[PDB]
Every structure is written in C-alpha cells, then in structure tokens.
Symmetry: D2
Subunit: 236 residues, 4 copies
C-alpha cells in the first residue's frame, strides 16, 4: 500500500478508530490511529493557519494550528522519519466529508525542504509558495474532487453554490518529487505552512484536512472517504 506520514486536522470524533471524543490535531504514522493528538476547537467560518516542522537531528515532528485572536493547539511526536519514509516522496493536502460536511478550502500553502551537507549551501533544496491557486495548475496533481475556484482558492472537497457536499474526497499533491533524505546528508529538514477555511451551515461538521507525505505514486485508496481522510484504505 502507500506509506503515509500525515498531520490531521480532525473535525469529527470517530471513537471506534481511536479518535478522542473531541476535535483534535493528530500525528499519523502509517495509520489513521494517531500516535499523538491534542484537543483543537474548530472555529466554523474562520481562517486558520497550520505550521509543521521536522529536522532529522532533533527527530521531532511538530505541528501547531492557530486562529487569529490567540487560540492555538500544538502536538509533537518523536520519530526517525528516515526509517519510515522512502528517499523520494510527494507532499500534499487531503480532505474529506462523509455524512457530515464542511468546506475544506486551502487559501495558501508553502513548503521548504533542505538536505544539508558540509557548507552553508544546501546539497539540495526546494521551496514553493502558493498564495493563490491557478485555474488549471500544471504544478499540482489534483485527485478526486479537488479543484481550484474562481477566487483562486483550492477546494479539496466539493462545494456547490457555496454549500459543501457530503461524501466527497480530494487531494492535491505538489508535482515534483521531493528528495526527503539522502545517505550523504548530515541533516534533512522540512517546514510547511498552510491556511484553511472550514465552514459549514451545520453545527455538526466532518471530516477534516490533512497535510501528508507519501510515496511518489500515491493515489486515493478505495474506501478512504469520510473518517479515513482520503489517506488510508482501512482503519488498522
């Protein structure tokens, strides 16, 4: 199957697959059953920001999600990613809805990865930023229901005339493979930021957004809708 590392912004508690009984941010290593979670209160209709970082010396994957006005939730997990991920990966954003629904709108996304050696100059590095998305982006792979709208936003799941739809799944991956580690590298690091808008006319919302790193040929698994966030074929 795919090899997935993800940070989920999980807006609906599914306690049979080990979610806590509240909305949460989580770090997922090869499974939907998060290795670490923290309570996170979703603000329906407000723009939030997530920042994710990792460095191979520290071996600590951390994420923080915040809204304007002081509310922030952080989660970290110690793991050596060189022994989880393959050498070449693609990075992406995924989201889903199920019975309950929400917009999963991405307003901006930046990512940096560096492979360092014996110099201030990196052996290899990549940095991209999108603060607006093109109508027909040649540098993104859009999967499932993902599309860009006339406002320049990335809509990971279906929205019709301003209302989000049930049972939708979509992902966007950056087109270039990322060289996330190398046997000569002394340090490898990456940092990602994205801003998002989760909104729904309903009080009950689902299912969430995830930032993920996968094998380069990753596609949406069959049966990964709803609680599996378009990332996993099952809940093991």
């Amino acid at each position: 199957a795919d090899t997935i590392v993800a940070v989920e912004l999980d807006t609906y508690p599914n306690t049979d697959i080990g979610d806590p009984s509240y909305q949460h941010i989580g770090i997922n290593i090869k499974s939907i059953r998060s290795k670490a979670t923290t309570r996170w209160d979703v603000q329906n209709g407000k723009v939030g920001t997530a920042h994710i970082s990792y460095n191979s010396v520290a071996k600590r994957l951390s994420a923080v999600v915040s809204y304007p006005g002081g509310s922030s939730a952080t989660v970290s997990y110690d793991v050596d990613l060189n022994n989880i991920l393959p050498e070449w990966v693609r990075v992406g954003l995924s989201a889903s809805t199920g019975l309950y629904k929400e917009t999963n709108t991405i307003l901006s996304w930046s990512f940096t990865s560096k492979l360092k050696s014996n110099s201030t100059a990196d052996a290899q590095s990549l940095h991209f930023t999108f603060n607006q998305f093109s109508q027909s982006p040649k540098d993104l792979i859009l999967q499932g229901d993902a599309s860009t709208d006339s406002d320049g936003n990335l809509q990971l799941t279906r929205v019709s005339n301003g209302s989000p739809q049930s049972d939708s799944v979509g992902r966007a991956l950056y087109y270039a493979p990322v060289h996330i580690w190398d046997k000569s590298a002394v340090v490898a690091s990456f940092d990602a930021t994205f801003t998002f808008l989760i909104k729904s006319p309903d009080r009950e919302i689902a299912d969430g957004i995830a930032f993920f790193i996968a094998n380069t040929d990753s596609s949406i698994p069959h049966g990964s809708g709803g609680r599996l966030l378009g990332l996993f074929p099952d809940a093991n």
Copy 2:
C-alpha cells in the same frame, strides 16, 4: 516547433550561422542567431559561474559569466518575455560537442521564479538549488547523453574515462513546470545561477552550454547536435 529562450556559452565560432569570430556569450530568442553577444574567453579546465536574471518591469534579460581572478563577460537584451514565452515553461541546461569536444560539466544550479501581486507575499514562487546531483535524480528530466556521475556532477555530454566525446548532446530539465507569467501578476521575475567546468585535452574545443526556457514538452530536436547546442532543429 519548440519556443526557446536561451543564454548560450558558445565555445566555438560558427560564422555561417552568425557567430562572431571568437568565443562568446549570447542571448537567443527563438533562434540560434543570437540577438546580442559579448566576447568571452573560455578558461579550459577552470570552474566558471553564470548568473542570469530577468524582471518583467525592467524587461531586460541579463547574463554574466565569470571565472575566479577577475575575468567576467556580460550581455543584456531588452525584450518583453510575456510576448515570447507561454505561461507555463520548463527550465533546463543543454550542451553539445561536434567534431571538437569538451566536458560540459555542471557542478551546481539554482533557480528562483516569482510571480508578485499586491503583498510582500508572492502569489506564487519556486526556488530550487542543487549543489550536488543524485545518481538517479527523480526531480530532473535527463535527455540525450546527460547523466550524473559518481562525484555528484551533472555531465551534459558524454565523458569516457575522463575524456569528453565528439558528437554528443544532452539536456537536463527541472521536473516541475514553472508558472513564468500570469494575467493577474504585477511583476514576474526569475534568477538562475550555475557553475560549470569546460575542459578538454585539445586546444580547439566545442560546442558550448546553454541555459534555456522552453515549452513544457520540449525534447531534443532532430539534427540539433554540434553548433545548434541541442536547442534548435535548424539555423534560421
């Protein structure tokens, strides 16, 4: 055919296609017959650096090539690239040899492109750096004879046991399409740097190296070896 903008480092004068009678750097817009050239004295066996820049407000494409110890050659040409290039391009390095030959070795390559709007934050941007090349690079498209060697260098044309070979052509393109202009952008700019080593056991060398920007599906044209630098099918 392809749409090509290139900066050539031309090591062999072919005066029937309009080269000056000396080695030179040139700016090529859709033709091998450079729109602007400057004399450039190749230092066989030394590492040189090229820096190339363009900004859509200034509308001036400039290049400088230098060797350690003070020797530098610059060339510029005023042109509106929005009316030459398509919206999406790939960027790359090309080189060739013919009857005369040289190594066309690339030691490092960096590129930045930005599309700016009404903020310090770019609408879109891309930056990559390679100070070493991987043995099997998933983020480069290698065409023709191009390969990476065990030292981590990019060899655009064939070298066997340390000697360069005649009648070789090769190119390397960065894998991701680059969004080089957009109808909403207020400014688009790009900057590229690469370092190279042209060496040959012979006093007479050929044919040169070019940095180029092309339509995304660009491939080596038939008959583009030698003086056409792997860029053009003919000398019109």
Copy 3:
C-alpha cells in the same frame, strides 16, 4: 550632504521643482527633481503595493506601484549605482505632509540584497521582512515623527485620533548597514517591496512616501518637510 537614491510616490504636484502636473512615481538620483517619472493615480483609502528592483549587470532601477483591481504604474531608469552610492548604505522609508496631508502608513516591508561571486552561494546577503511592526522596534531607526501604532503599522507621519496632521516628516531606516557593493562582487542586486495606505478626509492630499538608500549616517535634513519628502535640504 547625504547621498540619496530614492523612488518617490509623489501625491502632490509641485511644478516649481519640476514635478509633472499630476501625481506620479519618480526615480530620484541625488536630487528631488526626478530623473524619470510616470503618471500614477492615487486611490485615497486603498492599500497599494510597491516593488523596486535593481541588478548591477542590467543597470536598470525599476519600480512598479499597483492597487488591487488592475491599476499599475511603472518607471525605470538606467544608471550605474556603483558610481552613485557608497559601499555601505542604510535603506529606509520616508514621508511628509505640508499644507495638505494624508496618512503615510506602512503595513509591510521586505528587502533583499545580494552580493554574488563564483558560486550559487552568495558572498554576502541580507533579507528582512516585516509584516507587522513592533511597539518599540530595536531593529529600526525611527526619525522625526515616525512611530508604530497599536495595530502594528508603521506611521511615518503624525496621525491623531485617526486624522493625519499637516507639516509632519518621518523616516524609518533598517538598523543594519547594507553592503550594497564590493570590489570583488561580480553582481550586486537588491529587491524591495512595501505596502502602504494613503488616506485623507480631504480631496487634496500631500506630500508622498519614498523608499530610499542613503549613506549610513543619514538624518532628516533641516527644511526637508513638505515637497522635499524628508530627503533633501533643498530643491536643486
């Protein structure tokens, strides 16, 4: 006196010192009497963006100022800055009001300077970004009436209870001297962006905002209020 290179956003025509009879953007080299201008229509109360760039190979200083919704004005001037500016400079923003007045509010400011040599790695470089300004910024030199407000904006000229005041002048300089050229550099370049809000309850407004580069010990000249934008002691 000081040595000043500036890009002015001039909101009030003073035709006795050679302004055109309309609002304009201008490039100023050691004098208020701009070497190049372009018509610019100020949108009272809207946030605008300016982008300024220079590269020592191209020898073209360019600026563009734009507002959301497609309105943009550009100006360029060819000049070798190595023969105008000293080796070490400070960079800054200046503004003034006179009989007529406006807010001269800076919302964000970014600057990059690079001195390049024979590598992808710069010999020296500096990049700073402010998207918010601190209440007591230790990394800015504030001169005259300049202050930061409780919203995190930089107010270059006096505002009292939301109204701008007449006969005010203020500047902000970045604290570190910038090494803008070096006798070993093959290329020197800089790029600056800032966003601003010029607003006034009056239909008639003055005097403008300038981005400037000066000798490191530059201070506001006596008598530089109003039309001289806090940059020059006289109109020669």
Copy 4:
C-alpha cells in the same frame, strides 16, 4: 550579568568545570557547565560544519557538527527558550585559546530567524549569509582579538604569520538585534550554520568555538579567557 545560550565546540577537556574527559560538543544554558554533551573528535587542519536549529513548538535545541568523509556528532536539549532569553538578542560566534592554542577560523556563517503568525508570510524574519568576510565589516561587531584577514576569513582569535597564539579571546556579533520572540507569535524558530577551521602545529589544542545568543549589549566578561570561551565570567 549577560544571559547566554550557547553551543560549544570544546576542544580541551577541563574536568574541574564539568567537561567530560574528551573533546565534545555541548549545549550551554546560562552556564559553562553544559546541560548536554556528546563526544566529538576534532580533526586538526580540516574544515568542519556546524548546523544549529530550534523551533518554539518542538522546544528542542539541536546541533550537529560534521567533517567531510562521514564523521558527525549531534547533541540536543529540550528547553523553552522563551523563558530563558529576552525578547531582543544578538547572535554571535566566540572563541578562545589558553595555554594550548589553535586557529579559530570562521569561513562562512548563515543565520535565519522567523516569527510566525496566521499566514504563510512571517510576522518578522531575518536572514543573513556571509561566505566571505569584508576587511572592515560594518555589519559585525568585533570584540577582543577578532579580526578579518586578507583571505576573507574571520579569525576569532589571534594568528601571527600563520601560527595561532596563546591566551587570546575574540567574538563577532551580528550588528542588528534579533527579535527572537514576541507575545503575539505562534511560533519562533531559528537556524544557524557555520564552517570553521581549527588547526594547530601542536597535538594538544584549546579551547574551542561557540555559537551564542545573548542580551544585545553583551561584551566579553572579564576573566572569560581559556576554558570559559569568552562567554562567562566564572564557572558556576
């Protein structure tokens, strides 16, 4: 006194102040008696690289020091720096010799600091790189014996006709204060890299190099030579 956080490259074991009995890298929080150390074998006469990173979500300060050819040593320490350091700091490099001596030569130094908020755009950020040092650097504060030489290197301690001298101490601080945290910031991070050459004609060498972060008005304490690395007035 000063408030110092430092990463030491300690080339001489002083076991009365708690050094291990071997050369080591260490993380120092307000004291020379390192909170964490790792064995590090100095290669006399070879160029090494150090990389240091911290992020306020992860709260893990990490350092790695490496030489070409695969030899690397890493150390990390978990600490909340917001509760150690003041809001504004200067960053710097320090070194010393005592009875035993070595060159403490810095060949390059890069530093980045970011204060992040609710956007891909940083609230504030600073990045500088030096791959060569100017003869009279206006953007560094040189303290004690520190000087730049005709090769463009930074010599933190005295060298005469290619030989290092005993009982020398010197530091270099970047001129601009760095805004290392802010009460509105969601994340603060910094990353530093430098390359160095420790060489001596003697088999026994001392005392080491440190990267440090201090209160902005930090000066070399009296009696901080030798084992105290120019950082502390005593060994408490």
